[PDB]
Structures are given as structure tokens and as C-alpha cells.
């Protein structure tokens, strides 16, 4: 026997609708997470300060993620970047909302790290993961994307765009590179190593 123990939110209520009821577009995870942040803001359930947009990438923009819908099985998808929502519940128990995972929606942090992320120990160093964590309030206020990165040079869509107008602010219409970048000298939020990330939010 082992005691898995602070306070565990055993009665946790999701901050989102059911997976299938959520606004989702394949290859637009930055916008899928943005829409979850907007839903949490307009819903009177959880404070926005408890929620974070998490960008996963690296210098070479080649990161493995396991348990992904786009590739069923034991092998990973190699993304240029991926975005999930992190909810740190009042007690300190963390939950991951990833609309692209075959793990539960939402999923306990430790379970998502264990099965989806795994250790960088025996991973080829060029594939190792870094994490930019942005408060959901700061993500909604500062994030802008004109979707120019999803068009070819001829101007045709690589993947069908989301069925609503481009997200913009007063300050910018495109700053997506400042979020995907894992340079701590650019952008909003904090950039973490895997060990720093798993420690901060993991039990």
C-alpha cells in the first residue's frame, strides 16, 4: 500500500463543456485553448487566474506528444508546437484540457505528464520539450493570430481554418511566434524546462 499524499479534488467539476461540445479545429490548438479560456471567463464557475495556456515547443520546433488522436497507438505525433489548457484547482491539484488527446478530457496533470509527455531523459536532445506558461487573463488580452502561418505561398489553406473571425487585439494582429518561441527574453508568461514544469504544477 502507498498513500498518494495535499487535498485531491476527487469531486472536481470540469471548467469546460464535454469534449464533443467544444469549439475544435485540427492544427489550431492555440485557438482551441483560447476559446476554452473565453468560455471560462464568461462562465461564473472558476476564476480566470487559476487557468493557464501552455505552449509546448523547442528551438527546432520538433516535439513528440503521445496519446494524440491524429496518431492512435503507442507512437508519438511530432508537432512544431502544441497548446493545452492547465487548471490549477484551489487545493493545488492540476488538470490538463487537451482536445487532441485520447486520454480523458479533462485529465489529472501527473497522468497526462506520465502518458502524453514522458521523461526527456532518454529522448534525443533535439526533440526535448520546453513549456511557456501564460495566465489565461494575459492570453485573452495579448494573443493575436491572422492565420498567415497556415497559408502556402500561393495563398491556399494547409488545413481548413476555424469557423469564426481571426483573433486580434488593439496592439497586434499577429504575435503567434512570441508564444511558440521558448526564448525567455521574448513574449508573456514564464518558460520552463520539463523538470521545472512537472515540479511547479505536479503533486
How distant is the alpha carbon of residue 31 from its chain centre?
10
Q: Which of 94, 115, 96 is nearest to 107 (CA)?
A: 96
Task: Tally helices (H) and strands (E) across the chain.
Answer: 5, 8
The verdict on residue 12 lying in a domain is no
- Domain assignment present for 59: yes
Cβ contact 91:9 at 8 Å: yes
**Can you give the resolution of this entry in Å?**
2.2
Angstrom distance (rounded) from CA 191 to CA 152 = 30
In a domain, 79, yes or no: yes
H or E stretch at 31: helix 29-42
Closest CA to 134 of 55, 25, 23, 27: 55
Task: Indicate which CATH number applies to the domain containing 122.
Answer: 3.10.620.10
Query: How many domains, the chain?
Result: 1
Nearest Cα to Cα of residue 32 among 12, 55, 14: 55
Amino acid at each position: 500500500q502507498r498513500m498518494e499524499g495535499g487535498p485531491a479534488a476527487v469531486h472536481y467539476q470540469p471548467a469546460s463543456p464535454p469534449r464533443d461540445a467544444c469549439v475544435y479545429s485540427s492544427c489550431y490548438s492555440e485557438e482551441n485553448v483560447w476559446k476554452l479560456c473565453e468560455y471560462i471567463k464568461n462562465h461564473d464557475q472558476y476564476p480566470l487566474e487559476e487557468c493557464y495556456a501552455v505552449f509546448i515547443s523547442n528551438e527546432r520546433k520538433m516535439i513528440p506528444i503521445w496519446k494524440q488522436q491524429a496518431r492512435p497507438g503507442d507512437g508519438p505525433v511530432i508537432w512544431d508546437y502544441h497548446v493545452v489548457l492547465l487548471h490549477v484547482s484551489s487545493g493545488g491539484q492540476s488538470f490538463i484540457y487537451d482536445l487532441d488527446t485520447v486520454l480523458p478530457f479533462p485529465c489529472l496533470f501527473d497522468t497526462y505528464v506520465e502518458d502524453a509527455i514522458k521523461s526527456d531523459d532518454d529522448i534525443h536532445p533535439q526533440f526535448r520539450r520546453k513549456f511557456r506558461v501564460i495566465c489565461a487573463d494575459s492570453y485573452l488580452k495579448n494573443f493575436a493570430s491572422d492565420r498567415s502561418h497556415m497559408k502556402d505561398s500561393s495563398g491556399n489553406w494547409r488545413e481548413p481554418p476555424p469557423p469564426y473571425p481571426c483573433i486580434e487585439t488593439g496592439d497586434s494582429k499577429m504575435n503567434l511566434n512570441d508564444f511558440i518561441s521558448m526564448d525567455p527574453k521574448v513574449g508573456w508568461g514564464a518558460v520552463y524546462t520539463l523538470s521545472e514544469f512537472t515540479h511547479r504544477f505536479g503533486s
